Amino acid sequence: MAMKDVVDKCSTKGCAIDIGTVIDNDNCTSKFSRFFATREEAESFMTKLKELAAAASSADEGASVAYKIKDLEGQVELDAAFTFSCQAEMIIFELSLRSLALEHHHHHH
């Protein structure tokens, strides 16, 4: 009772680095917040964010970055706003963050 079994379309190369995760829809500028024990811990983590930013966004010096450092009592707030040009580069950055840094609690978005 069945006759139709034919399909052919595997033309995809995967030029864009995607883990296969969902897309966060609202902005193109992502804001990454983490709480550390020292402002040192905050600025130390910024280093690897820059490393990751260079991978996600090429550009001359990468995407735009406006970071927050709030000196609290016993901890600090590290919140870096990365202004990307595309949403693709923004979401994959979040993906990379989840892969490398991992500890952003878990399911933020």
UniProtKB/TrEMBL annotation:
GO terms for cellular component: cytosol. Coiled coil: none annotated. It holds the Pfam family DUF406. InterPro entries: DUF406 (IPR005272), UPF0234-like_C (IPR035571). It comes from the Bacteria. Belongs to the UPF0381 family. PANTHER family: UPF0381 PROTEIN YFCZ-RELATED. This is DUF406 domain-containing protein. The lineage of its organism: Bacteria, Pseudomonadati, Pseudomonadota, Gammaproteobacteria, Enterobacterales. The gene is yiiS.
